[PDB]
Amino acid sequence: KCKYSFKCVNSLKEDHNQPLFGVQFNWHSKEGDPLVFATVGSNRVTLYECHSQGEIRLLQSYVDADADENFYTCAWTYDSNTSHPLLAVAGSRGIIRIINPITMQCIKHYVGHGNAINELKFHPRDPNLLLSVSKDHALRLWNIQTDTLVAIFGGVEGHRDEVLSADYDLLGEKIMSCGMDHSLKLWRINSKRMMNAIKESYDYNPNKTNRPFISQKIHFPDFSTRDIHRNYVDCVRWLGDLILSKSCENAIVCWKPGKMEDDIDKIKPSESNVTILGRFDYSQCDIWYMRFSMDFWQKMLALGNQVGKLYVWDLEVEDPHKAKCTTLTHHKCGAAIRQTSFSRDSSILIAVCDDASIWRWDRLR
Numbered sequence: 001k002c003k004y005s006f007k008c009v010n011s012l013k014e015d016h017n018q019p020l021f022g023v024q025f026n027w028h029s030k031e032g033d034p035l036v037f038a039t040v041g042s043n044r045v046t047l048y049e050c051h052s053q054g055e056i057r058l059l060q061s062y063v064d065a066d067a068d069e070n071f072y073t074c075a076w077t078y079d080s081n082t083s084h085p086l087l088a089v090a091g092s093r094g095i096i097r098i099i100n101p102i103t104m105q106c107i108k109h110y111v112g113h114g115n116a117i118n119e120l121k122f123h124p125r126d127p128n129l130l131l132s133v134s135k136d137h138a139l140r141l142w143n144i145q146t147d148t149l150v151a152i153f154g155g156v157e158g159h160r161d162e163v164l165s166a167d168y169d170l171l172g173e174k175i176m177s178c179g180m181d182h183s184l185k186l187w188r189i190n191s192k193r194m195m196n197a198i199k200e201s202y203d204y205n206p207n208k209t210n211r212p213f214i215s216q217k218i219h220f221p222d223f224s225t226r227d228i229h230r231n232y233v234d235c236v237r238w239l240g241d242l243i244l245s246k247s248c249e250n251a252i253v254c255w256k257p258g259k260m261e262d263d264i265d266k267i268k269p270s271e272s273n274v275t276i277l278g279r280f281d282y283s284q285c286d287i288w289y290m291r292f293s294m295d296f297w298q299k300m301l302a303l304g305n306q307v308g309k310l311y312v313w314d315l316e317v318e319d320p321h322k323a324k325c326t327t328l329t330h331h332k333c334g335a336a337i338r339q340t341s342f343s344r345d346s347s348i349l350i351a352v353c354d355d356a357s358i359w360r361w362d363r364l365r
């Protein structure tokens with residue numbers, strides 16, 4: 001048996017009855033402050049608090065003025081200067097909105113992607129750098145302090161189809177992206193070119209020059225493979241220097257570029273080998289856009305499937321690809337679980353569903 005046990009303590013359904021596509025705990029809150037997570041779906045962004053006796057306390061909602069916006073994803077950050085939390089959301093309109101979670105009002109917004117945005121990620125060491133991933137086949141790195149587009153990752157050897165997912169490594173030196181073209185691509189952002197681009201993006205003063213700020217066009221990833229999956233890749237995360245990624249073949253694959261002994265930071269762009277370490281098998285999760293998540297210290301891996309089962313794997317264990325997961329089911333939870341989120345201390349796991357239901361699972365302590 002997996003050593004991580006959870007009990008379902010609460011559930012609720014949102015009034016709009018549309019699929020909830022994203023859920024994110026805020027990992028930037030004080031160990032003293034209450035645990036807060038956001039859900040997104042329809043034209044709605046909703047905040048909830050977790051409290052004693054399994055309560056899920058509704059805090060506040062944001063409804064977009066555009067009735068036909070469809071939010072797919074959200075990401076937390078904080079303002080460098082005020083230390084106050086900020087929430088980025090985006091979806092089918094390709095517009096990035098920054099919401100003030102205290103007032104739940106839109107502060108500013110970025111247009112630019114020519115199509116839907118499927119994922120948002122904030123740099124783990126610079127909270128002002130937001131990465132967006134788009135159906136126009138590109139990734140974009142924004143500086144939301146100076147409202148500038150730093151770089152566009154796409155072109156000659158960028159993705160050939162819609163990009164679905166991306167993730168920064170531990171320190172934010174590199175990005176792995178993936179999408180409908182079956183490929184996984186690595187983009188290093190600690191190169192001198194990207195370092196200078198990031199620095200220039202901070203020095204940009206509009207009321208001090210008339211020349212617009214030109215984004216760096218990054219056309220060549222630092223590594224690319226289509227040898228991991230045989231179909232689209234709808235989720236990728238770094239596991240240390242290893243990569244976890246999934247397609248619609250009912251497995252998360254753990255792999256790394258190069259040969260097994262090869263250091264990630266010496267992989268050249270022309271590297272043709274990958275090493276598959278193993279896979280996490282499951283069933284009934286072969287529909288498009290089902291995301292997996294890990295806890296802060298990457299001791300646990302969670303994936304929901306299309307009939308409401310929630311798998312949790314212990315990542316600390318020997319022979320982890322052959323170990324049985326914990327399967328969490330509730331007889332009232334039958335809809336597809338789109339994304340899950342662990343609280344900062346791994347005490348809570350929240351799942352959100354295609355029928356607008358939210359499920360709260362508490363780790364037995």
Ligand SMILES: COc1ccc(CCN2CCC(Nc3nc4ccccc4n3Cc3ccc(F)cc3)CC2)cc1
Pocket residue numbers: 170239240241242254277296297298315316320321
């Ligand atoms: C917020 O800051 C932090 C700081 C640290 C961390 C932990 C990173 N973690 C990353 C994974 C590490 N395992 C690990 N590397 C390996 C390298 C080669 C071969 C096997 C390896 N295996 C074992 C393994 C392989 C596959 C698998 F599916 C499970 C285990 C162990 C360390 C998280 C957040």
